[PDB]
Amino acid sequence: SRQRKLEALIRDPRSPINVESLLDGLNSLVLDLDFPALRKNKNIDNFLNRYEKIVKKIRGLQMKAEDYDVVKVIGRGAFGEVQLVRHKASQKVYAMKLLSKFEMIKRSDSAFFWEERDIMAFANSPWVVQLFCAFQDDKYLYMVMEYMPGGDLVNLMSNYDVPEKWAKFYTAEVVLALDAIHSMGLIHRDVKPDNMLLDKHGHLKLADFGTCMKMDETGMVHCDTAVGTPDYISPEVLKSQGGDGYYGRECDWWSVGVFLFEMLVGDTPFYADSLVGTYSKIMDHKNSLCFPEDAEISKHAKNLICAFLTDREVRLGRNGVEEIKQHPFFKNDQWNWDNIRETAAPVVPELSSDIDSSNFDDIEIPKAFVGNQLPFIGFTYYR
Amino acid sequence: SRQRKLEALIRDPRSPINVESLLDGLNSLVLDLDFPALRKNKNIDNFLNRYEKIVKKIRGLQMKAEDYDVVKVIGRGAFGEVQLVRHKASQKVYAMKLLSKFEMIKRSDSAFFWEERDIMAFANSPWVVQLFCAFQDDKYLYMVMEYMPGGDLVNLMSNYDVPEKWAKFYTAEVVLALDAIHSMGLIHRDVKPDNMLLDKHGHLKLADFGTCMKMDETGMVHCDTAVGTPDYISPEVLKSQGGDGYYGRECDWWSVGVFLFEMLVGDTPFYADSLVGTYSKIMDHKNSLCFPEDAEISKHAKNLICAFLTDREVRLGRNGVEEIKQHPFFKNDQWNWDNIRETAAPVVPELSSDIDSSNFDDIEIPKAFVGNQLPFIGFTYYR
Ligand SMILES: C[C@@H](N)[C@H]1CC[C@H](C(=O)Nc2ccncc2)CC1
Ligand SMILES: C[C@@H](N)[C@H]1CC[C@H](C(=O)Nc2ccncc2)CC1
Known about the structure:
2 copies of one chain form a homodimer.
Chain A: H1 2-11, H2 19-31, H3 42-61, E1 68-77, E2 80-87, E3 93-100, H4 101-106, H5 113-122, E4 131-136, E5 140-146, E6 151-152, H6 153-159, H7 164-183, E7 186-187, E8 196-198, E9 204-206, E10 213-214, E11 221-223, H8 235-240, E12 245-247, H9 250-265, H10 275-283, H11 285-288, H12 299-308, H13 321-325
Antiparallel strand pairs in A: 1-2, 2-3, 3-5, 4-5, 6-8, 7-10, 8-9, 11-12
The complex binds ligand Y27 (2 copies).
One copy of the ligand C[C@@H](N)[C@H]1CC[C@H](C(=O)Nc2ccncc2)CC1 binds at residues 74-75, 79, 82, 95, 97, 129, 145, 147-148, 194-195, 197, 207-208 of chain B.
């Protein structure tokens, strides 16, 4: 019937008008209307006094910050915050992200939580940190995700001399995770060690997605903003900043190269004091790139890095991931391309409790109807 | 769980935030926002282009004027319209009311469809025409209700000499229907033959409710507008027009009196050429009321009429319906107060098809965010 067809969409968690959508819908409309200012308008007042009561009972029944306990903040910065939390009822342990709504739109034109949400909600991939539920309130987005007790790659690199045996591993894992995202029609565009976390067993997942983007039917994207961390940006993306940016996934392979280099050499290949110095060097890569003579690297590890750090037109992986997978550097004995996430991780976390956070550092009205909650509608996500 | 408690309300057809509410919610928000004018606002545009597509598929799946065929208009006037319709899929026959949204609020401050809706939706009473579903579109409310093939009492009276045997019957039926409404905490306030229809078997239901009102915990209402048909208004309601109106249900019994009189005498007891003449007479009832000498009425039929047409302070039924039920006028042989709607109606309709309509007559952008659909949210009603 027409009637079932409806109930389909309202339930489908991938539908833009499932229950949460609507409840977000109604809920934001309250917020964006409830001011002595526009309550002057006839309609607006009546309406608000009607739903008034019920909306409070609802606000109480839904998911709430309160449903959780903060074990401690394990990541703060220019974004919002990550806290180790304990679900009060389930007694269980999660990582929760807090995003400033205020920031989120008004400043960030290019931090699409939308993309992020869907990915963590529905990637259903061993390569992608997973989102168990999302909710908002007036100020905040909240993302409840698997606690990754291993810490990030920055932290890891920060603590060890990474031999190549190790590096092979992390690189491979990154490549797999990236190809995941790619083959989901997305370009990641922000491949940095800070976005790579390790689970309980010391295997990798990608944990941020705020900058991903659906590709052309040709595999390309059209873009005019540069995005990412200065140190890791590709030339093409750097250039896209000047309007008329057109590039594919191979920009993610660029960053991989950097990553490898940083992992093997313990510095990033285009370090400078200015960001422009950095940029300068990135554009000048053909001359700016090279290896300290005391760095102990294999020739293969050098080819691969070099095969990555070049212009899209020649860069490795423009022919897809298989030629990457096939580079000599990867020949090894502990794993192959199919079993790797089953093999022994090179650094195994030893976690004494389910809240052991040793791998992280300690931290330190309108006039018009404006309608600010609109973009947050359909964010709340359940199960 | 908290989680089930939710799904309760979203399903409960009596909840102000069941699915239709929300879908009305989302839907009206589109309409009240989709203008080149405010699409200038950042939020408003983005939002609208998002839901854009999905809302069209929905608009198609829901209940639509189109789902029905118009057999013919059987009532038009200062309200909107009633049409005999055939549900296309079920092949079945209903009466459908059309209300101008434009009118509905902007002019009418006192035509609470809300009250009407709930009554016909949920009275679930043999005395109350029944509502099978309600839907809106941009212009209109639509009410799908049982076709009452008998026509109204105005029509009936218009066609026969009503003997008292008959009158006893219709009055009794009215009294029962009224007491129904009352004992649902409501005062009807617009008792007129035009609001009394007859079903297939020639029994009565009340078909309009736009003027009903929840009573005090004391059984009273506070009111400052007069409502009803000039000919039938009670003194107290007429006076309420002057601010400080305070009265109970016994104002509905006033109108009953009129009704009886009109039925027995074939004219209304306070007829004049002006409305004020009428009003004059109504206030002057103590002297203005009396019976033409050629009118053939029983003494009992006169007491009762007179017992009704007096000031609330003394009027019959201020002590509840039982003293009415007990008036001698009602002594009869065909029915008692409990079986009446099972007994033989005095005028039995003879309807040759399921669309025989012989008992009816032939008929002949904003600037600000204004928010006009708000008051219509939660009107759509299903099953
Ligand atoms: C650098 C930013 N793009 C961003 C990287 C991911 C990080 C995170 O989600 N952390 C996390 C998740 C789960 N468990 C532990 C940490 C927060 C900040
Ligand atoms: C006079 C107004 N208060 C109003 C009276 C009720 C009427 C109606 O619903 N008519 C109707 C319903 C079902 N079947 C036949 C007619 C429409 C106009």
